[PDB]
Structure 1
Amino acid sequence: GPNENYYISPSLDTLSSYSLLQLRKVPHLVVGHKSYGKIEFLEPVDLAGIPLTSLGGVIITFEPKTCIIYANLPNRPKRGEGINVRARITCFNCYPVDKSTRKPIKDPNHQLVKRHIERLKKNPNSKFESYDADSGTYVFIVNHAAEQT
């Protein structure tokens, strides 16, 4: 996908061309900007017209290091249907160099990569998926759709 821009399941406009059920029943959700990072959602989107614009405008934002939802939207479904965040997020440039020595690290050296992974395990707020040393890419799943209250 050497696409300069980002593609969707199968695009903002392409999605609109969806049938009545298809629009409200989004099978596979795929959103990625290649360079920014590949993000895939296993959740659905039932709106029967995509009225996201009313809620915001961009409908979807992705920082080239961090993922951005609608706006800290804890899946607040006051009225209508909402999409869960039960998906995997992938971010590039995991290696944020070493500030201690300012050692520009851009290789699979993994000098302190192990330390970062250990911290993730302690964090019981997100589910660790799989970490690739060769690509240094970090993928994890944080589904907060379900609330205990």
Structure 2
Amino acid sequence: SGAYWMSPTADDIRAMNRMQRQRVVGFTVGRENVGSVQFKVPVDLSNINLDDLFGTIVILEPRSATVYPNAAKKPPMGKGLNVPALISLEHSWPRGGPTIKGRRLERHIERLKSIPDTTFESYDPETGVWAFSVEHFA
């Protein structure tokens, strides 16, 4: 477990004017002890309920980032939060855990690169964080 957060904060976004809230740049939803989703393009938050986002629209649990869990209420690609994003997930160690090193650790990284429907960004062997991009959440 861990606290969810967003950046810009919900209060920052509420203080934006009408043109600004339709194109929020750098929008990031994170959760302590899990990781983060950084949206890569400006997002229109004018019709999203910022008080019912965490755990409802964006769900972060260890090794699991989900955006729009209800298939009947998921906008098309390019609308809302269904847009390109950079996802960074803690706890992405080799199957044998944080102590795996050497040749197996090299192959682990190569297998992370091949995970379908992701574009590998990085793997940090010290922290166990795997980062990758997605084009959308469809």
Name the CA distance, whole Å, in 2 between partners of 1:34 and 1:108: 24
Greater share of residues in strand: 2
Residue in structure 1 matched with residue 6 of structure 2 by the alignment: 8
The equivalences for 1:56-75 within 5 A come to 58-71=56-69
Which residues of structure 1 form unaligned runs of 5+? Answer: 99-104
Q: Check conservation: 2:4, 2:32, Cα contact below 8 A.
A: yes
| CA 1:96–1:116: 2 relative to 1, 3 Å | closer
Name the CA distance, whole Å, in 1 between partners of 2:91 and 2:102: 13
Indicate whether 1:29 and 2:32 are aligned.
no
Name the CA distance, whole Å, in 2 between partners of 1:143 and 1:72: 19
Residue in structure 2 matched with residue 109 of structure 1 by the alignment: 101
Q: Check conservation: 1:24, 1:48, Cα contact below 8 A.
A: yes
Name the CA distance, whole Å, in 2 between partners of 1:118 and 1:70: 29
Amino acid in structure 1 at the alignment position of 2:33: S
| CA 1:52–1:34: 2 relative to 1, 3 Å | closer
- Secondary structure at 1:89 match in 2: strand
| CA 1:122–1:97: 2 relative to 1, 3 Å | closer
Which structure has the greater CA radius of gyration? 1
Residue in structure 2 matched with residue 143 of structure 1 by the alignment: 135
Name the CA distance, whole Å, in 1 between partners of 2:63 and 2:113: 20
| CA 1:115–1:72: 2 relative to 1, 3 Å | farther
Q: TM-score by structure 1 length?
A: 0.68
Q: TM-score by structure 2 length?
A: 0.72
| CA 1:13–1:59: 2 relative to 1, 3 Å | farther
Aligned-residue identity in percent: 35
